[PDB]
């Protein structure tokens, strides 16, 4: 009979097989495919889901704060943040034997704990947290915020509180409020916290809710701000002998732009960060008054889009009708948001390792490596999702009649040229990068290392020289002492920036050579190939020569059968599917390069990387084989240490990856026949045929098989690299 689950799909509820549960779980968030769904109901469900997501995020943050305040060593880590390892949380496992108990008992705790690698200790220490009471109060506050967000999500679904469809389409009002309030006012408030709490707490002065109304952030007290003498806030900054957390060497300035890093914490100045947030707050608030909402002044995005067509007709109709195809399509907005968020996540990773913002973050090698790898993998997944949603937009929301002659239609008009050129770039990069690598490998194998091709990256070195690095000797722009660009910043920020960039002990514009050139080309190959697969799948989503009516089958369908030569993996979903492997490979190459260069930097031997990164054998032996010795020795027949959990996780990831290869290689048919034999065996077995199944056992579908195999592949990939990176970086240092 018809089952209750899933309530959103009547066709799935009538399915008498096990496929009903799987499809009900995988199509729960596809509100557009639900039964009796309207546009207004769609937007309302997304609103409630957004509130629930915020509730989960805030609860997770409160949980991290609570566990650090309860089972951590934050009160002891602030005293000696160079020789004390941060504690994530305690370990309570009845499966642990005695050696595992004393092995994980470290960091000054009274029992087995986990050493945190997220870097929340440095972040909380920099923003002003000093005691466990502060973390406890922050945890309770975030839990209350999470409960409020959850209640808001439940409340916006009840009658008299459901927003209308017209409210969700007010793009001008939403953009104005997000730029001025969500971005500008939030940044201004963060500036207020840095000026009022973080900066005085870094100078040994406690400023909490009990005394912030009686403690002045500056000795002049708002007089220079109102009189326009803003330069008075940059007078007397922290000297080079300032000790973080104490008043020794501290200054009085609150808004500076010294640049560079703090001599002790090796991080950005707090006054510089406060000034940064103040400037971007003013800029975002000003930008929040651009669109017309209810007072006559402002813009209409439709007018700006319609008045942006070239006169010669190079772009056809230009952007006519682009306002309606974006405002009425949620997949277009989701794709744009994911593309920007993925790029910003990558930007965060690069800027965070190169310019550490939190105190004593550069010394924590495990934290730096884990944070960079985490943000780069998150960025790669988000980028793949952006392109997948672009393909979904082409299939479900693109209207050729409304987008007639504009840039959107012209993209599909010459999609063959785009795919062909992406293919050519990827082919050239792959052929040459692989050829140079194999050539260097043959030269190193034959005992002639002077015969390998080592192309110097003169363009990137030229840019590094433009930033102030005098190692290469170009002597121009910031590298030349007689340039206008150099002389115009010598009194504001160039001294600190130049001192930091010319220091070879940090990660600020590291020295590069032929190995960096080759790996950068490998990165370019990965980016271009992943882009080729994603772009080709989005452009061919509506159809191709093999499947002229692909848009009539949806975004995800198994195939079109073995006819016409065979149509396996013809849908756009399959294109995203194949692109996830390339994304994992690209992020693997970038994280491998980052980890090896930083490992050789921290070990004090950059020549090892410079001489072994030019051939793949050096990558396999000097980086993968050499750095995994301590990892695989976490547990051996002679005993175990605290690093055994990473060894177990290493083997765990290998097992999950290999398990994924099963769903990836073997296909449905074999499993369906095997399941039929199992059905017969259960039906003909006494004492067991009395227990019957409620859902008919069937093999996983083709699409489900691909998703399951990719999920196992990605999980094994991530867990294996995370275990190796954390174990190698923590054991070495």
């Amino acid at each position: 009979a018809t089952k209750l689950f899933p309530k959103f799909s009547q066709g799935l509820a009538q399915d008498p097989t096990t496929r009903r549960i799987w499809y009900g779980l995988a199509m729960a968030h596809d509100f557009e495919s639900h039964d009796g769904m309207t546009e207004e109901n769609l937007y309302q469900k997304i609103f409630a889901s957004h509130f629930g997501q915020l509730s989960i995020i805030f609860l997770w943050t409160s949980g991290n704060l609570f566990h650090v305040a309860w089972q951590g060593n934050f009160e002891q880590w602030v005293t000696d943040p160079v020789h004390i390892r941060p504690i994530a949380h305690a370990i309570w496992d009845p499966h642990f034997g005695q050696p595992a108990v004393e092995a994980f008992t470290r960091g000054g705790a009274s029992g087995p704990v986990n050493i945190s690698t997220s870097g929340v200790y440095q972040w909380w220490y920099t923003i002003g947290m000093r005691t466990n009471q502060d973390l406890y109060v922050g945890s309770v506050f975030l839990a209350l915020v999470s409960a409020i967000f959850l209640f808001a999500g439940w409340l916006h679904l009840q009658p008299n509180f459901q927003p209308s469809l017209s409210w969700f389409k007010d793009a001008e009002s939403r953009l104005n409020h997000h730029l001025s309030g969500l971005f500008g006012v939030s940044s201004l408030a963060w500036t207020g916290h840095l000026v009022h709490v973080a900066i005085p707490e870094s100078r040994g002065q406690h400023v909490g809710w009990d005394n912030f109304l009686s403690v002045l952030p500056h000795p002049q007290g708002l007089t220079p701000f109102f009189t326009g003498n803003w330069a008075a806030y940059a007078q007397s900054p922290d000297t080079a002998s300032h000790v973080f957390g104490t008043a020794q060497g501290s200054g009085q300035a609150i808004l500076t732009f010294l640049g560079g890093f703090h001599p002790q914490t090796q991080s950005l100045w707090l006054t510089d960060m406060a000034h940064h947030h103040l400037a971007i707050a003013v800029i975002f608030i000003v930008a929040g008054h651009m669109y017309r909402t209810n007072f006559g002044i402002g813009h209409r995005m439709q007018a700006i889009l319609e008045a942006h067509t070239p006169p010669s007709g190079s772009l056809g109709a230009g952007h006519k009708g682009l306002f309606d195809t974006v405002n009425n399509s949620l997949h277009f907005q989701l794709g744009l948001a994911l593309a920007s968020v993925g790029t910003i996540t990558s930007l965060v990773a690069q800027h965070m390792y190169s310019l550490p913002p939190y105190a004593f973050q550069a010394i924590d090698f495990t934290t730096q490596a884990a944070l960079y790898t985490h943000h780069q993998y998150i960025a790669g997944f988000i980028m793949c999702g952006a392109f997948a949603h672009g393909a979904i937009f082409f299939i479900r929301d693109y209207d050729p009649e409304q987008n007639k002659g504009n840039v959107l239609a012209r993209m599909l008009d010459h999609k063959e040229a785009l795919i062909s050129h992406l293919s050519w770039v990827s082919l050239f990069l792959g052929f040459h990068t692989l050829g140079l690598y194999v050539h260097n490998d043959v030269m190193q194998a034959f005992g002639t290392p002077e015969k390998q091709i080592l192309i110097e990256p003169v363009f990137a070195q030229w840019i590094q020289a433009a930033h102030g690095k005098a190692l290469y000797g170009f002597d121009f722009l910031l590298s030349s002492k007689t340039s206008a660009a150099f002389a115009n910043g010598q009194s504001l920020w160039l001294p600190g920036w130049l001192d930091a960039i010319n220091n070879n002990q940090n990660s600020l514009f590291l020295t590069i050579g032929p190995g960096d050139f080759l790996v950068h080309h490998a990165i370019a190959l990965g980016l271009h190939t992943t882009t080729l697969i994603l772009v080709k799948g989005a452009l061919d989503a509506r159809g191709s020569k093999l499947m002229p009516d692909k848009k009539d089958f949806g975004y995800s369908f198994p195939c079109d059968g073995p006819g016409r030569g065979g149509t396996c993996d013809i849908s756009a979903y399959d294109a995203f599917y194949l692109a996830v492997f390339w994304m994992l490979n690209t992020i693997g190459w970038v994280t491998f390069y980052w980890h090896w260069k930083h490992l050789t930097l921290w070990q004090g031997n950059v020549a090892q990387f410079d001489e072994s990164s030019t051939y793949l054998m050096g990558w396999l032996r000097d980086y993968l084989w050499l750095n995994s010795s301590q990892l695989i020795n976490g547990y051996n027949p002679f005993g175990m240490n605290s690093l055994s959990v990473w060894a177990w996780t290493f083997l765990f990831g290998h097992l999950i990856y290999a398990t994924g290869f099963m769903f990836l290689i073997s296909w449905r048919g074999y499993w369906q026949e095997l399941i039929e034999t199992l059905v017969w065996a259960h039906e003909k077995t006494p004492l067991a045929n009395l227990v019957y199944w409620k859902d008919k056992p069937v093999a996983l579908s083709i699409v489900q098989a691909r998703l399951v195999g990719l999920a196992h592949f990605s999980v094994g990939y991530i867990f294996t690299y995370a275990a190796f990176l954390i174990a190698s970086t923590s054991g070495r240092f």
Binding site: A1, K3, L4, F5, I21, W70, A90
Partner: protein
């Protein structure tokens, strides 16, 4: 203070690991196989 007792992990870890998942799995299993009227 918000500090939990010393015996809090010995009670919450077995709860969240065996009691709560068993109840959740049983309730979810009954809900999935429930037949519509």
């Amino acid at each position: 203070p918000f500090v939990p007792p010393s015996w809090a992990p010995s009670v919450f870890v077995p709860l969240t690991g065996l009691v709560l998942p068993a109840i959740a799995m049983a309730t979810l299993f009954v809900y999935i196989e429930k037949e519509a009227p």
